[PDB]
């Protein structure tokens, strides 16, 4: 969309209605007359447009009103309220922009931010943008967290996030203009190659793919149309549902062969009865003919009873000869039906062993996308974020995704090698207690009005805890932490001296010999300018290949590549890197997924701040002190980079409203 009104789309806002957010900040406008609503909607969309049309410089309130023109530039408090709502909640002036109004001389309030991943960094910049004192505590020796980039010489390869899923409404679009990143489209053509080493024929690659998509849609039918969502008091997963749908297609194949061959018998026995009437009729014509010969033998002139006997037997014999002929057309008709029916048999199998193997690759691809075995995904809810998918081509970053965070970290107080170990929040403030990663003896104490936790969901899940909360987190939050899923997904970077693959194909598959190993190195990426091939490990394979040395892993990759490209066409790689995200103690997984028995409501639970009890009994209810951000706190855009960033912007607006006040609700 375009106009002021692609501004609303590119900001993930309806252009022609107010959101629950805005109803909360502008309750006068939403309960007001429809015409003031349309005024506000235009003012919002127009300011969003001005920011989007140039996101490398701050959009001040009075640069804004300079460009809104009448009747819309008449109410200057409505324009000042709108601009301030947007600025506060990160819809404008977020990311890396040039600042017109330089910072307040003196800060207000102090926030500690656990983790300097993208969600951490994006809040930290917004808070420091708002006047606060901000400090980030980061266990690793580098920023970006699960945006990890490998760099040796000229080889560059993301071990973490790698793809931008479409710029249609993606906040990373704004960041792309702000920070130069070489965004290069991904050609979606993916040739599959079986374990033998040779391509799937287009006849099959298209059969199975269509069958995969039809099987998926079939589970959706089971879920939303037959309420197949519980089995034995436990919630149904996507994997169980796919397996039930597969079994019922196998059942229907056998049901078809049954009633087909049961039509051959119903007609093969209708034949049996017709031959039995034709033996017994031929034996009766054998015997009448004898009687007619004998009666014909009595030579004439005879008396009339003996003439009757010749006439009679002749009529009787032609009557049975007529009857035997009519049972001969009928024998013919049935003899052709059986030739027809037997030459038109139905399908012998639902899927052959070669077919199911290629279908497993499409399941490995899906375990790859959701970073978890299909047996763990909730059937009802695993795709609940699909309605908010961005538009356009999925892209990669030729210079490494690390450039985004590293760019956001500029200007910010970041303590690296600082591992938070305990979080203390009380009615009067908070202290975070961290240690030094190099030597765990060197202990640090940080005091603050608020803590922003962006600990990955797998760190929060860790038992025994890597981080202790004092007082402990309430059960409504720890229960969300157990119910949610934290998946796993690993990469093998293969660094070669020369390109030996098809340069015009960005990616190509490898079909597994078994279901159990469908994700073991089932896919290869070629996106870098240089000779670098990435191999993915998805599904149940991902957590098992972390108990196997790099050399054995690189070995299997070479073998697979040798079969696909020929044993002499693939040299030993110059440099190799194998990721282990479940092992990584600052991640303990790759990203979240909607587990069976979870829902999208658990992601809202993860986002709610925590408010401690009063220090003195009878004291008034305190302010919230512990806030949460990260990919597992944004229900509509989880498990991604854009969703981390968006949640950082969310909490920064929420912390500022709590500690700096929101003067745009009047």
């Amino acid at each position: 969309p375009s106009g002021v009104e692609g501004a609303a789309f590119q900001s993930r806002l309806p252009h022609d209605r107010m959101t629950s957010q805005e109803a909360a900040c502008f309750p006068d406008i939403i309960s007001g007359p429809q015409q003031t609503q349309k005024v506000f909607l235009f003012i919002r969309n127009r300011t969003l447009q001005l920011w989007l049309d140039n996101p490398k410089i701050q959009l001040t309130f009075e640069a804004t009103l300079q460009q809104l023109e009448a009747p819309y530039n008449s109410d200057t408090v409505l324009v000042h309220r709108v601009h301030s709502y947007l600025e506060r909640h990160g819809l404008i002036n977020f990311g890396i922009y040039k600042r017109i109004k330089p910072l307040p001389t003196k800060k207000t309030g102090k926030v500690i931010i656990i983790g300097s991943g993208v969600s951490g960094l994006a809040a930290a910049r917004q808070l420091q943008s708002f006047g606060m004192d901000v400090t980030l505590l980061e266990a690793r020796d580098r920023v970006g967290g699960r945006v990890a980039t490998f760099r040796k010489g000229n080889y560059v390869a993301d071990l973490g996030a790698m793809v931008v899923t479409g710029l249609g409404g993606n906040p990373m679009a704004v960041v792309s203009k702000q920070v130069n990143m070489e965004l290069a489209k991904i050609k979606q053509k993916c040739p599959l190659y079986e374990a033998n080493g040779q391509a799937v024929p287009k006849e099959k690659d298209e059969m199975v793919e269509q069958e995969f998509n039809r099987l998926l849609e079939a589970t959706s039918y089971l879920s939303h149309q037959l309420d197949f969502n519980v089995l034995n008091n436990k919630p149904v997963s996507l994997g169980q549902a796919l397996e039930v749908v597969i079994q019922l297609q196998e059942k229907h194949v056998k049901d078809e062969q049954i009633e087909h061959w049961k039509k051959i018998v119903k007609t093969q026995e209708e034949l049996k009865e017709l031959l039995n009437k034709m033996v017994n009729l031929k034996e009766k014509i054998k015997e009448l003919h004898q009687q007619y010969k004998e009666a014909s033998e009595v030579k004439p002139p005879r008396d009339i009873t003996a003439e009757f006997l010749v006439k009679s037997k002749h009529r009787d014999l032609t009557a049975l000869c007529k009857e035997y002929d009519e049972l001969a057309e009928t024998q013919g008709k049935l003899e052709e039906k059986l030739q027809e029916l037997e030459a038109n048999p139905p399908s012998d199998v639902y899927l052959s062993s070669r077919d199911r193997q290629i279908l497993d690759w499409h399941f490995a691809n899906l375990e790859f996308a959701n970073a978890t075995p299909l047996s763990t995904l909730s059937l009802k809810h695993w795709d609940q974020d699909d309605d908010f998918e961005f538009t356009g081509s999925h892209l990669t970053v030729r210079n490494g995704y690390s450039c985004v965070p590293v760019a956001l970290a500029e200007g910010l107080d970041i303590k690296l090698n600082t591992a938070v170990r305990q979080v203390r929040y009380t009615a009067s403030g908070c202290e975070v207690i961290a240690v030094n990663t190099r030597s765990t003896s060197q202990t640090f104490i940080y005091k603050c009005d608020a803590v922003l936790c962006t600990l990955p969901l797998g760190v929060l899940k860790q038992q025994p805890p890597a981080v202790q909360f004092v007082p402990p987190l309430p059960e409504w939050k720890t229960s969300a932490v157990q119910r949610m899923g934290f998946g796993n997904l690993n990469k093998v970077v293969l660094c070669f001296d020369r390109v030996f693959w098809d340069p015009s194909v960005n990616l190509f598959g490898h079909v597994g010999s078994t279901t159990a190993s469908r994700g073991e190195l089932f896919l290869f990426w070629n996106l870098y300018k240089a000779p670098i091939l990435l191999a993915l490990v998805a599904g149940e394979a991902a957590g098992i290949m972390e108990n196997i040395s790099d050399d054995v892993i690189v070995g299997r990759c070479l073998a697979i590549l040798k079969g696909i490209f020929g044993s002499s066409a693939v040299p030993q790689p110059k440099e190799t890197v194998v990721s282990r995200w479940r092992a990584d103690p600052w991640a303990r997984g790759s990203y979240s997924y909607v587990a069976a028995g979870s829902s999208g409501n658990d992601y809202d639970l993860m986002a709610q701040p925590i408010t401690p009890g009063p220090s003195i009994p009878g004291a008034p209810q305190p302010i919230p002190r512990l806030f949460f951000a990260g990919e597992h706190t944004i229900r509509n855009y989880p498990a991604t980079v854009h969703g981390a960033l968006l949640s950082g912007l969310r909490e920064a607006g929420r912390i500022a409203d709590q500690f700096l006040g929101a003067m745009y609700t009047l």
Binding site: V245, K251, I258, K262
Partner: protein, 133 residues
């Protein structure tokens, strides 16, 4: 509102493949063995019918009699009268048959003769005698 084309799912079947851990594998061997059951029932009635097919070798060809083409006449010879009273005794009211025996009386003047010569050939008593047989 309806499942994808080429996909079969019924609320009925789905319960049956989920009643227990192997109720899936059960229902699919019940139909594997029902399918063998019917296949050997075919190759068995296909071998019965190959034998019955053989007994009918050469058909009924040595036994056919050439048809006689005879123009249909109107006057009733004493011979044709006596053939008729005997066909009545044998065929009751199967006019077609009776007309085929006599050979040159068609089916209507069979009807006419049940009536004109009903008195003199005692046709009533004849039919009763045929009736008890």
């Amino acid at each position: 509102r309806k499942p994808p084309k080429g996909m079969f799912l019924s609320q009925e079947d789905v319960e049956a493949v989920s009643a227990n851990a192997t109720a899936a594998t059960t229902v699919l061997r019940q139909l594997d063995m029902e399918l063998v059951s019917v296949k050997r029932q075919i190759q068995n009635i296909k071998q019965t019918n190959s034998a019955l097919k053989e007994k009918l070798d050469g058909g009924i060809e040595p036994y056919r009699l050439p048809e006689v083409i005879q123009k249909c006449n109107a006057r009733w010879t004493t011979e044709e009268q006596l053939l008729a009273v005997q066909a009545i005794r044998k065929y009751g009211r199967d006019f077609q048959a009776i007309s085929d025996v006599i050979g040159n009386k068609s089916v209507v003047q069979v009807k006419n003769f049940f009536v004109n010569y009903r008195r003199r050939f005692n046709i009533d008593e004849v039919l009763q005698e045929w009736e008890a047989e």
